[PDB]
Design goal:
The chain is mainly beta and about 325 residues long. It has four helices and 24 strands. The radius of gyration is 20 Å and the shape is globular. The PDB classes it as hydrolase.
């Protein structure tokens, strides 16, 4: 089997992407944030504290004939941005772009943190990291991808995120019309539960390529590109007036600037992030100070190839017995 679904930016900055997901019988369609950096499929629901729901579409298990409470199971997650959610668990039928999993764990939120409430466009998350990170207790649950894997034509999914435009998540096949040149594959470590890999270096604008190993995660659920302070400083030094602002919480730059591109290495191949992808606009409405899309990972504890990086590529998440990541230009 295969699936194919369009993923759409939630706003004009590509802060995140939502993909429609059918849950239950009859289908309840929720727009979920596909997140290769976590492993829980959780939704706003009829059980969510009413004051914590503000415009989201909810899953109502009692209206699904295929929903079954997973007795005794609870979940609770905290994300890298300090947001969180928790609740109980149902199993139900879940379909993405024509690909159906029966008995998928659907984690129903009883509580969500303010950032989730405040984002009306995101009805929940669909985790696509490794199932070892799943938070369901006392019986850990599998991701949608893990459950689908054996039925898929090929045990892969691909992320093709758009810049200020829709893109695609595919399951079970590689669309050879969706990228240019070749896909370069690189090794993955699953030791931390992430799609963790090592970039071979970077360049800033038309500058020479610096060969250096950068260990990081491919994370569709993180907006920006977080890299070591040395790398980030080298980037922003090429933007007149750019500076790190503790009050704002990262590098800002004059909105009048033209940003240089940023290149990252995948083996001997190179992915170029155009400068415009690195512009996240005014820090506040009407400001002439703009927020940068490349930020320091110092104090995160890990480098993160988030949407800024991934949207410059066609990315293969290969879930074969030995997982790998593939990147192509597009």
């Amino acid at each position: 089997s295969t699936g194919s679904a369009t993923t759409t930016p939630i706003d004009s900055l590509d802060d995140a992407y939502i993909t429609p997901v059918q849950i239950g019988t009859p289908a309840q369609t929720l727009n979920l944030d596909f997140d290769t950096g976590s492993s829980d499929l959780w939704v706003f629901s009829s059980e969510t504290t009413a004051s914590e729901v503000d415009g989201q579409t909810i899953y109502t298990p009692s209206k699904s004939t295929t929903a079954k409470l997973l007795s005794g199971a609870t979940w609770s997650i905290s994300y890298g941005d300090g947001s969180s959610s928790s609740g109980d668990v149902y199993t139900d039928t879940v379909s993405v772009g024509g690909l159906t999993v029966t008995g998928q764990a659907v984690e129903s939120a009883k509580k969500v943190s303010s950032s989730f409430t405040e984002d009306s466009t995101i009805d929940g998350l669909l985790g696509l990291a490794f199932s070892t990170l799943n938070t369901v207790s006392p019986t850990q649950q599998k991701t949608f991808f893990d459950n689908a894997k054996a039925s898929l034509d090929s045990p892969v999914f691909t992320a093709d995120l758009g810049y200020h435009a829709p893109g695609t998540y595919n399951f079970g096949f590689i669309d050879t019309t969706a990228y240019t040149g070749s896909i370069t594959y690189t090794a993955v470590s699953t030791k931390q539960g992430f799609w963790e890999w090592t970039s071979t270096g970077y360049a800033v604008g038309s500058g020479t390529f610096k060969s250096t190993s950068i260990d990081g995660i491919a994370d569709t659920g993180t907006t920006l590109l977080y890299l070591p302070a040395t790398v980030v400083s080298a980037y922003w030094a090429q933007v007149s007036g750019a500076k790190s602002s503790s009050s704002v919480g990262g590098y800002v730059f004059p909105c009048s600037a033209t940003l240089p591109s940023f290149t990252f290495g995948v083996g001997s191949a190179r992915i170029v992030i155009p400068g415009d992808y690195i512009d996240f606009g005014p820090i506040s409405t009407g400001s002439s100070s703009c927020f940068g899309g490349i930020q320091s990972s110092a104090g995160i504890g890990i480098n993160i190839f988030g949407d800024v990086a991934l949207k410059a590529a066609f990315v293969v998440f290969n879930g074969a017995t030995t997982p790998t990541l593939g990147f192509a230009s597009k």
